[PDB]
């Protein structure tokens, strides 16, 4: 029984790392939500499936269900009732125990088999064994708890709307469950019971607005271990609102279960409009954004083992959900459109109106002439022109070489996309002369392809043949150099094109990571580090002692992030102090500014530090200490001396170091880290178990474990990628990210271009030394 005391004390020592914040009023409701989740999971098999939540006048909450009661048997190996085991024991490594520990009084009533049972807990310590009080004829379970006033400060009163919203959402998602919310302080009641499900969810949202068609699209299927439910409707607004869920957990950033929805909608609407001839009668072409105006939809999925980007959910990265949603949507939306013609007519009318409204926001663009089989029109032989003749609906791509050119040509859209290859690094027009620029070949080819003229005499910016120019180079540094050269050319020679906004930049990926059946694309090194951290912590739990519930995922992630930031900051300042000494100050007591003019404490502090350093040495170094006396302010500055490789060095810790921000950050991390792990602490990830003695050891073990079966692929250039990958990653208008170039200040831009791309070397060297060598030792730590 003594182990239960250790667990409860461990929970109560640091409540914020198990339930959440304790002053804003978040965990105070999280406890109720956890109890309600347990009740709704249990009571799913009840005869009537009803849940009652009550707020009493004495600031207490009770949750009651009508399912099968908690078993009241006695474990042979424990000698106590199963209810006490559920409410107290950790249930091995890896959610009512925390609530019991953080509440100053909890009452439990279990009635089953025609009997009534009752027990009372005080601070997690039972007062008497479970006893029988009377005979009944029903089944159920009630839990009533008084939140403790020693841990929850500031806001200590429950609200009514916060519970109401979540309960209504749970009633919407779980069809056939009745939830009643009663209040006693003032007196209010509600009853959430909807058998429609997502249809009622869509009706509730699209209530204060004005729908334009009567029927609502809806379906619900299951392909292989995956369930999909979708419902949508159109209103007369100009907004988009899509809500996504995964195992009754909302995601605010979408994921893989939204792209398939969008793509299927676009394909189905475009196919229907093309087949019915509505597009031909008009003189417009629809796009994805026009379709998604005044739309309300809800998407929900059921997956056995979901995978997310972080520990706060908010994004789904499972790779086998997109096709599952898309195939069903494509199959069923056409059938929906075929049965009901009036809604189809109304929707296509609205979409046509929006598309025509977009068209009236352009300029006067005369038609161009495109290179073709029967006419070359005096255009370069390396150009792969498109078929669209309107310059406002055409795009041009610039690539480094022939391999990338072929890879892009094999995976483009021939209707309104063109490719123009280049040859290596291009001339720098900032250091060259006008005649030298004219004598070049690549520049001449680019000028001919653009068809605007040169020299600012016949240069007419109204002759541009493509209203979208996209720069797409490789993902390494040479691509950046070529991008800078092209930007310099465009800014120095054709300012009007940049001013009007006809220049874009593409973002191809650099890495591809695969583990099991999971795949993902990584842009640069920061995303690589984030991915490593995310996959390291998946399915991992930490116990601070032998019998203690595991810490929350968010707190562990925050600790890992802070530790990594501190480690990077320490690594950036290795040139001035030994790294081993800096890494040891985290676990040592903080030396305050007041404890510097008193003496007899600095001596003990430095002696303990030096003894600890000498204890763990494994490289042959020797540590000695000294105390410096200052006659000006009567201070006492510590001195540390070391001998490495037969060389003696001295590192003094002065007054400035104590008051600096680096030591402040180190102490801030230490305050959280000190005294956390007890003696018998263990870590586990999945099934593997490993006892640990330090945070660093556990982190290293997790990192090493997470790397089994991992594959990494690096793309030297665009010629190393398959055409389908390049299309779906960079060239598809539905799933691409680009940037538009603008000018903020002309004087600053001109000065920067002159400094960086000019002929003089000294200003460039000074700029590089100032920006790169310096300004990297950020001493803010805030």
């Amino acid at each position: 029984s003594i182990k239960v005391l250790k667990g409860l004390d461990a929970v109560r020592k640091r409540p914020g790392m198990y339930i959440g914040d304790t002053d804003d009023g978040t965990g105070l409701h999280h406890m109720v939500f956890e109890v309600v989740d347990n009740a709704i999971d249990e009571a799913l098999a009840g005869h009537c499936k009803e849940i009652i939540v009550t707020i009493h006048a004495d600031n207490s909450v009770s949750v009651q269900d009508d399912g099968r009661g908690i078993p009241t048997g006695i474990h042979p190996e424990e000698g106590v009732s199963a209810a006490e085991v559920i409410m107290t024991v950790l249930h091995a490594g890896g959610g009512v125990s925390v609530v019991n520990a953080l509440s100053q009084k909890l009452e439990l009533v279990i009635q089953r088999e025609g009997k009534i049972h009752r027990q009372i807990y005080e601070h997690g310590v039972p007062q008497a064994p479970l006893a029988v009080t009377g005979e009944t004829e029903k089944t159920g379970t009630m839990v009533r708890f008084w939140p403790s006033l020693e841990t929850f400060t500031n806001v200590t009163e429950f609200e009514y709307e916060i519970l109401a919203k979540r309960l209504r959402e749970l009633s919407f998602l779980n069809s056939g469950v009745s939830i009643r919310l009663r209040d006693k302080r003032d007196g209010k009641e509600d009853h959430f019971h909807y058998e429609g499900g997502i249809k009622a969810f869509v009706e509730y949202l699209n209530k204060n607005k004005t729908p334009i068609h009567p029927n609502i699209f809806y379906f619900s299927t299951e392909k292989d271990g995956i369930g999909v439910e979708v419902a949508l409707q159109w209103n007369d607004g100009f907004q988009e609102n899509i809500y996504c869920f995964t195992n009754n957990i909302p995601q605010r950033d979408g994921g893989t279960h939204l792209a398939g929805f969008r793509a299927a909608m676009t394909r189905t609407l475009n196919a229907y409009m093309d087949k019915e001839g509505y597009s031909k009668k008009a003189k417009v072409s629809a796009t994805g954004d026009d379709a998604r105006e005044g739309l309300i939809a809800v998407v929900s999925v059921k997956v056995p083992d979901p995978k997310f980007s972080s520990q706060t959910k908010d994004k789904l990265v499972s790779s086998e959900v997109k096709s599952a949603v898309e195939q069903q949507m494509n199959e069923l939306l056409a059938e929906y459109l075929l049965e009901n013609p009036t809604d189809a007519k109304i929707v296509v009318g609205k979409i046509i109106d929006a598309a025509r409204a977009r068209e009236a926001a352009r300029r006067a663009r005369e038609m161009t002439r495109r290179k073709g089989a029967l006419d070359l029109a005096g255009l370069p032989g390396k150009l792969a022109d498109c078929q669209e003749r309107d310059p406002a609906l055409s795009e041009l791509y610039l690539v480094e070489g022939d391999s990338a050119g072929g890879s892009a040509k094999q995976g483009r859209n021939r209707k309104n996309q063109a490719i123009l290859p280049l040859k290596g690094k291009i001339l720098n027009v900032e250091k060259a002369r006008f005649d030298k620029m004219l004598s070049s070949q690549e520049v001449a080819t680019l000028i001919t392809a653009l068809g605007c003229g040169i020299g600012r005499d016949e240069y007419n910016p109204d002759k541009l043949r493509y209203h979208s120019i996209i720069i797409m180079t490789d993902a390494d540094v040479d691509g950046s150099h070529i991008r800078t050269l092209l930007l310099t050319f465009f800014y120095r020679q054709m300012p009007e094109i940049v001013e009007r906004g006809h220049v874009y930049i593409a973002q191809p990926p650099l890495y591809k990571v695969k583990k099991g059946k999971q795949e993902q694309y990584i842009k640069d090194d920061e995303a690589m580090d984030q991915y490593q951290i995310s996959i390291a912590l998946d399915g991992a739990t930490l116990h601070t002692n032998a019998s203690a519930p595991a810490l929350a995922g968010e707190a562990l992630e925050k600790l890992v992030s802070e530790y990594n930031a501190t480690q990077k900051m320490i690594n950036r300042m290795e040139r001035r102090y030994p790294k081993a000494m800096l890494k040891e100050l985290i676990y040592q007591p903080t030396l305050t500014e007041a404890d510097l003019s008193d003496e007899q404490t600095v001596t003990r502090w430095v002696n303990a530090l030096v003894s600890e350093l000498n204890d763990k040495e494994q490289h042959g170094s020797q540590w000695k200490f000294d105390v410096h006396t200052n006659a000006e302010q009567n201070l006492f500055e510590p001195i540390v001396r070391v001998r490495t490789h037969g060389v003696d060095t001295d590192y003094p810790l002065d007054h400035e170091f104590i008051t600096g921000g680096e030591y402040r950050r180190i102490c801030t991390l230490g305050e959280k880290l000190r005294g956390l792990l007890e003696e018998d602490a263990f870590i586990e990830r999945g099934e593997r178990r490993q006892p640990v003695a330090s945070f660093e050891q556990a982190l290293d073990w997790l990192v090493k474990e997470s790397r089994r079966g991992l594959s990494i692929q690096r793309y030297k250039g665009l010629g190393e990628m398959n055409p389908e990958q390049l299309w779906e990653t960079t060239m598809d208008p539905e799933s691409r990210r680009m940037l538009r170039v603008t000018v903020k200040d002309a004087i600053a831009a001109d000065q920067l271009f002159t400094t960086l791309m000019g002929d003089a070397v000294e200003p460039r060297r000074a700029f590089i030394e100032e920006n790169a060598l310096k300004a990297a030792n950020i001493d803010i730590e805030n």
Partner: protein, 98 residues
């Protein structure tokens, strides 16, 4: 290849789905364009390529006073839409040609 006839206007076009073995498509298109330019084949107005991820698709349009079958036969006779393959099976047996 085949011929499709418009329901309303009555205009007819030729659609090519597959090409013979060891044939370059770009050279075939260039050869057809060169033949049309020098006025050696009559009855062609438009020519373009529309191959995509679905499959090969080459579109040829005829004039108002031409028959599609005659043009198709002329293309068979003059272009690489039909080629000859000569079978000659020679291999080494016991280190000897045979």
């Amino acid at each position: 290849a085949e011929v499709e006839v418009d329901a309303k206007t009555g205009r007819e076009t030729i659609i090519v789905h597959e090409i013979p073995y060891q044939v370059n498509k770009a050279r075939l298109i260039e050869k057809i364009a060169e033949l049309v330019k020098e006025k050696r084949v009559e009855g062609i107005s438009a020519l373009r390529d529309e191959s995509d991820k679905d499959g090969m698709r080459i579109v040829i349009e005829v004039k108002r006073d031409a028959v599609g079958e005659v043009v198709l036969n002329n293309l068979y006779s003059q272009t690489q839409l039909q080629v000859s393959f000569g079978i000659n099976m020679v291999a080494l047996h016991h280190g000897q040609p045979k």
